[PDB]
């Protein structure tokens, strides 16, 4: 239906098979419609993470340790204080932390309980690990007037270098850093143990693959190409296959959805893996 | 009309005769609809 | 459309030619509908 509340108009559009599902050519359905309503994100508003500082009201102090060492809790020999915090970019992602802060000295291992396997283990890097991700599709935006008044941005045509979106990782760099991480692990498990890395346990696509932001578009990458190694007792580059999705769920808040409008032109964001989220 | 905003569905339900009124089986109406919109 | 959500009725009304515009008796349109919604 168009603005003219009387007669419809046969139109067309492209949709990823991650967004739609077969009912029962064939009939398909927008996946969100079985769970909740979905809202189009405004084409003007962006999602670029911006550095935010936090401040306390008078009578309260922001304390900040400068101790390069920290187990996650305990006394700090070197404590300072600040007016407000440093700028932290709200980078929403999973597994791989992006555009965060760097650690000093050695790789940092922090966990609520290392002896307990149910808890997670935080790993903070010392050196930025470059990752370069690309979506080589110079596609158009056949916007359709689904008013009255309000407009919808559908997917036009896809032209250009029809390749699957993917990420480029410096392999030797990954190997080197991973090793530095294993050193730490050695230091909390023993000088005679074996360390193996593998992908997630599957299940939900959001926890399985790597979810991260990238200029309004949402990427889901198979990090099996990274987390596949091992260490004993004592270019080159990696290509990571990615998928695109227009309908996603943020913070795992069921009962709602959000439709991100496609972006015209080729996209090529850039970030640096600063930390990990191992279990 | 169910969630599928396209095809309707025939259902049934019970209502007290204090809630409904004859229009004009027979045709009946929710009494509130002549005065205002009822919010549940 | 009327309150009786089932059957419609034909009505009439007067409108200044400053308010309406020809589409394409003849067919006309409320001028505001090409720019935005309107509130009474």
């Amino acid at each position, epitope marked *: *239906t168009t603005e003219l*509340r009387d007669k419809k108009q046969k139109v067309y559009s492209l949709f990823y098979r991650l967004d739609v599902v077969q009912i029962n050519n064939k009939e398909y359905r927008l996946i969100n419609c079985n769970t909740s309503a979905c809202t189009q994100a405004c084409p003007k508003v962006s999602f670029e993470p911006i550095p935010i500082h936090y401040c306390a009201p008078a009578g309260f102090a922001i304390l900040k340790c400068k101790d390069k060492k920290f187990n996650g809790t305990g006394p700090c020999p070197s404590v300072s204080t600040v007016q407000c915090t440093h700028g932290i970019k709200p980078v929403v992602s999973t597994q791989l932390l992006l555009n965060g802060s760097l650690a000093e000295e050695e790789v940092m291992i922090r966990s609520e309980n290392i002896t307990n396997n149910a808890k997670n283990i935080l790993v903070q890097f010392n050196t930025p690990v470059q990752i370069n991700c690309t979506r080589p599709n110079n596609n158009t935006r056949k916007s359709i007037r689904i008013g009255p008044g309000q407009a919808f941005y559908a997917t036009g045509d896809i032209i250009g270098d029809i390749r699957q979106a993917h990420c480029n990782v410096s392999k030797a760099t990954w190997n080197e850093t991973l090793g530095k991480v294993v050193k730490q692990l050695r230091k909390h498990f023993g000088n005679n143990t074996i360390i193996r890395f593998a992908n997630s346990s599957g299940g939900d696509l959001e926890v399985t693959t790597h979810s991260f932001n990238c200029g309004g578009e949402f990427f889901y990458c198979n990090t099996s190409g990274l987390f596949n190694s091992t260490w004993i007792s004592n270019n080159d580059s990696i290509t990571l296959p990615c998928r695109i999705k227009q309908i996603i769920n943020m913070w795992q808040r069921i009962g709602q959805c959000m439709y991100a409008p496609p972006i015209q032109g080729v996209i090529r964001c850039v970030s640096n893996i600063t930390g990990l989220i191992l279990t | *009309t169910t969630e599928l*905003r396209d095809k*309707k569905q025939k259902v049934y339900s019970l209502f007290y005769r204090l809630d409904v009124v004859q229009i004009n089986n027979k045709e009946y109406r929710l009494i509130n609809c002549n005065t205002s919109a009822c919010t549940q | *459309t009327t309150e009786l959500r089932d059957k*419609k009725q034909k009505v009439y009304s007067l409108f200044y030619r400053l308010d309406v515009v020809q589409i394409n008796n003849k067919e006309y349109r409320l001028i505001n509908c090409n720019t935005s919604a309107c509130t009474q």
Partner: antibody
Amino acid sequence: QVQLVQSGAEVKKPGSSVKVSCKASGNSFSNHDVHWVRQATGQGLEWMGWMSHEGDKTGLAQKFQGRVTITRDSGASTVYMELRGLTADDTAIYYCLTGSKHRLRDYFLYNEYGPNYEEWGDYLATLDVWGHGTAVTV
Amino acid sequence: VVITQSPLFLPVTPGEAASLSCKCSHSLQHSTGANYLAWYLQRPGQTPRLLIHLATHRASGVPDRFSGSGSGTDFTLKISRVESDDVGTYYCMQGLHSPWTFGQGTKVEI
């Protein structure tokens, strides 16, 4: 190649009524519209009425308005046509037959506050299988 | 809603062409573009055979010497190379306006 079977020839007095019946092999009146057409000796075809195979539509010619009832048993196993107030003018062969329809949507106006307003309309497409007819002599 | 078929009676020399007219007081074109007119042949002793449906389509097994044309109010059935099997009465039938109606027929003979 559905086959239609019609009831036998009848002789009726002026002023009485006939009820003609028709069955279709494989219970085809469930899935194909029934028509009634009559023809007097040496004269043209005259369309009498029909029923949709959906069982949601019946219609008659102007001349049979108040004269004719077209009905069917449950499961559409048999179809019937009753003509009353017979005169010599009704002496004819009465045919049962099927046909297709194109239920096209004429009027329509989208609504942006719920379901839309539709107004379907059946339109005859073709006349497929003719029965052998029932001779009614008034 | 009236239908007039013309001519009423048509003698045709074997092998010659024949042209039948069916005209309606009202258009038989639906707003979707289809014309709901059909042609039927009835031979002596037989039930009618469908020749042409939706104005221009031959029915299944109808020889290609029968062809229909026309749109709106005026329709034509052409029979090339007429033979004794083509003898009988030709009826048009409008399917747009309820109640549906046959024309009064054109009688064709050799």
